[PDB]
Amino acid sequence: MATCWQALWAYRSYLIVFFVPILLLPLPILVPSKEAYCAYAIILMALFWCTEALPLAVTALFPLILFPMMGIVDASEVAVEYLKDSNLLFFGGLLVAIAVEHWNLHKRIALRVLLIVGVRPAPLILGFMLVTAFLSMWISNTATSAMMVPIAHAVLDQLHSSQAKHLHLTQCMSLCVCYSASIGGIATLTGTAPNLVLQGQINSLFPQNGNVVNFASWFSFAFPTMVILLLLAWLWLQILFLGFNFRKNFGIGEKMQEQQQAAYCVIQTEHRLLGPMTFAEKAISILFVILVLLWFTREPGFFLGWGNLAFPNAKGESMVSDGTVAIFIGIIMFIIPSKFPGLTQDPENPGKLKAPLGLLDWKTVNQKMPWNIVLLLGGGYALAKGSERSGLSEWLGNKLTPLQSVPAPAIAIILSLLVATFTECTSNVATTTIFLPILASMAQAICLHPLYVMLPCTLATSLAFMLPVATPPNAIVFSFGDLKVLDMARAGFLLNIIGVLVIALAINSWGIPLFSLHSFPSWAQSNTTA
Amino acid sequence: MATCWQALWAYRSYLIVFFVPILLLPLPILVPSKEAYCAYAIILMALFWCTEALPLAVTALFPLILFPMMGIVDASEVAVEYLKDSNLLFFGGLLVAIAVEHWNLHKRIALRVLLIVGVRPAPLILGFMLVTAFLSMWISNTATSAMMVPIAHAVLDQLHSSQAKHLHLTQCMSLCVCYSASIGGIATLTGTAPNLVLQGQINSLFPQNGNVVNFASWFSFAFPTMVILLLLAWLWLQILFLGFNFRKNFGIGEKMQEQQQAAYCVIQTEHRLLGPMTFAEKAISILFVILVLLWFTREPGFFLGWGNLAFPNAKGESMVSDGTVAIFIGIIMFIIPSKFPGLTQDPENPGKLKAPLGLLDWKTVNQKMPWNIVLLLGGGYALAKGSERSGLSEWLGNKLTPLQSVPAPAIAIILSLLVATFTECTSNVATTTIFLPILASMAQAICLHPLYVMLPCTLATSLAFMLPVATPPNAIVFSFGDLKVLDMARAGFLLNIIGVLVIALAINSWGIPLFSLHSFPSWAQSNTTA
Ligand SMILES: CCCCCCCCCCCCCCCCCC(=O)OC[C@H](COP(=O)(O)O)OC(=O)CCCCCCCCCCCCCCCCC
Ligand SMILES: CCCCCCCCCCCCCCCCCC(=O)OC[C@H](COP(=O)(O)O)OC(=O)CCCCCCCCCCCCCCCCC
Ligand SMILES: CC(C)CCC[C@@H](C)[C@H]1CC[C@H]2[C@@H]3CC=C4C[C@@H](OC(=O)CCC(=O)O)CC[C@]4(C)[C@H]3CC[C@]12C
Ligand SMILES: CC(C)CCC[C@@H](C)[C@H]1CC[C@H]2[C@@H]3CC=C4C[C@@H](OC(=O)CCC(=O)O)CC[C@]4(C)[C@H]3CC[C@]12C
Ligand code: NA
Ligand code: NA
Ligand code: NA
Ligand code: NA
């Protein structure tokens, strides 16, 4: 009878976990190679994340058993890949956010934000996108996400509670903060790390170049690209999760103004009934401002920060990172009392006073920390390390070489598509470092100017929108549990193509004059050209 | 008035955190050196752990801010020290223990253990010590602790609930399991990792030695040492936490037999009212047996395991570790259903069936995992790495050289005291690797036989009993929150001296005949001797 078909549909995750590793076994069986053994693991983890047949942190533990059991890397070497400085930065940022939420400062910030920008979905999403992109121009993307994801969560909670469809707004705001942190970092030379890697490669492979890639020329090239890509991402996320209406999205017309003025006066009254700030709110607000100001001035690149003055290494770089500052502020939050004269009496011995708790105690942290996101970030780093140790990146980099029998405006588009597809599985810095010296020689072989193929390769590494392991902002937005990986993939599949087309617009207009991409200059000559 | 003296005593942890870093500042100020900068951090973390002015995982985060801020190591290099394979082994073992506790198998195991060995404190502690030492002779110490600490916790909970002073029994059982895992590993050549390091050094520094250190001679030397040290540790932990009575400790005499027979019949009835095993209990019991059998036969050393047959490296060693097996079994626990035909109906849509949950879901794991012990183990590894990168181990190793103007039975005692003191701060393998080639040349300089100074150095690295970062068993016993670090230090300070005296007994009787430690053989000759 038909009662077996519901039993087969209820058990669908067990069937996925049993049948997906069997159906992909022809790839390691028919092609015995470490590149195929790593491609099997990448396809398996992507299929287990998009279907969510297992929890996210459980799928993130799969390199630890997969890579030693096919000879890619040792268990000792895959074990120290799961906790880097970018993961400690997330730990310290969320350690500050837990103290913000515990002492009701998140309600103050959310009510003041909703009092300033109002209650309209698309202008509020646009304001969050613009602020996240401007912050990501100057600090790290991970620091921007770890600062901005709980603020958007609190604003969204207060917006829900003032109106008593919201489950699409909670996806649109999370994905817009996630994508704005990645988009805004490409506009400056110090915004994302591969932007510096390109300058290191241009200085090493081509001396006598005369500092062709600096702060001013990179800004003049990559700021309109960032603005156009951010506005198109706003329009696409507004179309996909909200409607095609554009008057309901902007709150235009009556039967919409009435509910919006009612929600605005409800927000006004519940903000008025908060009172003065307590001692803990003032202390946490001062520490938050100090943390963001220390993140700004640590290593700016266009002037000399406190990380270069105090604590330099032999190369002059800072030995202290952003995660060090985050862990420092989070440790200080355990030491400052929550009330200063707060000497109470304990339920034990009746001759004792009692010191207050700190701004953080350990049991609040243990109840509130997303440890699955720590494990997800670590599993992403381990999969990215296994892709370099197996030889996938060297194999796919050497497939870009026979593209020489293609006209030059199409080489950049095909290369940008390939790099934007491959950067979902790997690291941005490693992909840039491996892929740039191949493209430099490929451009020297056909007498094409470098940075016609090196600038789209550097920009396409940042177009990482589909998988949780593509960028650390892609994993940080799963901290509250309302998102699915299928929503992120469905939103990012078109954003990759839109970003590739925006890079192709930027390299063929206003990138040709300010870089002289039609001349093949004399600093790119060698013994193989002529 | 006198009401200020209670306000000063209530605020004692804040005063410790403020005044201890200021009072130790003459050590980095008067002695500017990286060895002093690391000694400052070690003394500060030991003082913050023994007083517990901060939580344990918060004090374990101190290398991340300390080592880049005095130039010892970079933030990127100290960040990848916090999650090794021994930490993933604890994660996988406790991931199995959470599933044992969630499905009431821990009550079955605890009631059957209390039905077999009875209810008497000192014989039960001795049985746990003997089983933990015998298990630690053949598998890793971390695997033995991660298997045996929750079992002792469950037995202790059932023993408390059958008798309705226990707060001293819960310290004695935790510390006895912790110390038995460390003591039992010295008896075999494959029990602890420095035991193999010594054999590598004897083979590398002195060829033509004729395999003087093998399985049989190491067993014949180190098994009575282990037995004597285990019995003396049992007697000392019985004296320290229990009384000097030895008849109340063994339950001898009436007014003690009555309560013990009452507790035994209460245990009999509440074990009889459990019923047959469910599906989840049978599945978890089979997986537990399979996990311990895979831990036994992976890399035994005296025969060829499945880790050497399948998955070898170029040197023939196993690429798969014990943590890989633990993570493998813990991942399988998410896939097996808790009931097989358990198709229920969901509170949502009334046309759906519902698959059961697994033996593990993520929310039970998040509620039950001790993440502070993961951070504590990682902070210990980072402090141990900073001690090698700063140069403390090379500095303290070169202080063993001017001990040549001491008679030879006292050189071994002074060296064992120094190594047993220094191994509380550092790693056992690194201390052995650094300290053995200095002692070999020091013994060649005075025409003393090696292994008169290399065997006490190898054995004294395992006498690690005072600090949570000395051994991973020292950190695993804080998983349930009943212990203090001051109890561990108070119990281990005398056990270090007892172990040094037992090593001095073993090297001067029955170690002289079976190693010929009175002859200076011909394989230790060089160009500097004669
Ligand atoms: C160049 C200088 C740095 C510029 C940095 C980028 C620009 C940031 C502008 C953000 C403006 C957001 C609205 C107003 C400020 C935030 C709320 C606030 O001040 O709370 C006061 C609120 C108290 O207000 P009260 O109830 O009136 O006393 O809290 C505090 O005083 C302490 C807050 C410390 C941390 C502030 C974090 C603010 C994050 C805001 C994110 C906004 C995203 C969307 C913005 C759309 C703008 C178009
Ligand atoms: C050489 C072969 C391997 C030897 C390994 C080392 C020796 C281990 C002996 C441990 C004996 C402990 C008492 C009996 C076994 C535990 C309880 C049991 O059988 O549960 C059955 C109990 C069933 O109870 P029932 O159905 O109600 O009869 O559970 C199971 O069947 C599941 C078994 C899973 C694994 C259990 C591991 C228990 C470790 C206990 C450690 C005890 C420490 C103190 C022992 C002092 C001895 C002097
Ligand atoms: C951990 C739990 C959830 C089960 C996981 C099952 C699969 C996802 C994995 C785990 C072990 C894997 C196997 C481990 C080792 C091999 C040998 C490998 O062939 C070799 O010879 C590998 C070594 C080499 O030749 O270098 C082919 C893939 C295969 C069968 C792997 C196929 C995929 C398997 C079954
Ligand atoms: C963890 C947070 C909440 C509080 C930490 C306070 C102290 C435990 C630490 C943190 C910063 C440390 C300082 C960081 C750097 C230095 C410089 C150092 O002198 C140097 O010149 C170091 C660099 C070098 O010469 O190689 C002397 C120690 C001192 C003052 C350290 C003393 C101990 C301090 C105050
Ligand atoms: Na950035
Ligand atoms: Na990437
Ligand atoms: Na062992
Ligand atoms: Na140690």
Numbering used by the authors:
A (entry chain B), B (entry chain A): 1 to 164, 213 to 578
What does the literature reporting this entry say, word for word?
NaS1 and NaDC1 regulate sulfate homeostasis and oxidative metabolism, respectively. From an overall view, both the NaDC1 and NaS1 form a homodimer, and each protomer consists of 11 TMDs. The rest TMDs form the core domain that is responsible for substrate recognition and conformational change to complete the transport cycle.
In addition, we elucidated NaDC1’s outward-facing conformation, encompassing apo, citrate-bound, and N-(p-amylcinnamoyl) anthranilic acid (ACA) inhibitor–bound states. NaDC1, a representative member of SLC13 family, mediates both pH-independent, sodium-dependent cotransport of succinate and pH- and sodium-dependent cotransport of citrate within the kidney and small intestine. Citrate molecules are located in the interface of scaffold and core domain. Na1’s coordination involves the carbonyl oxygen atoms of Ser136 and Ile139, along with the side chain of Asn141 from HPin, and the carbonyl oxygen atoms of Gly239 on L5. Similarly, Na2’s coordination entails the carbonyl oxygen atoms of Thr471 and Thr474, alongside the side chain of Asn476 from HPout, and the carbonyl oxygen atoms of Ala518 on L10. To examine the transport activity, mutations were introduced in NaDC1 by replacing each of these residues with Ala, including the Ser140Ala, Asn141Ala, Thr142Ala, and Asn476Ala.
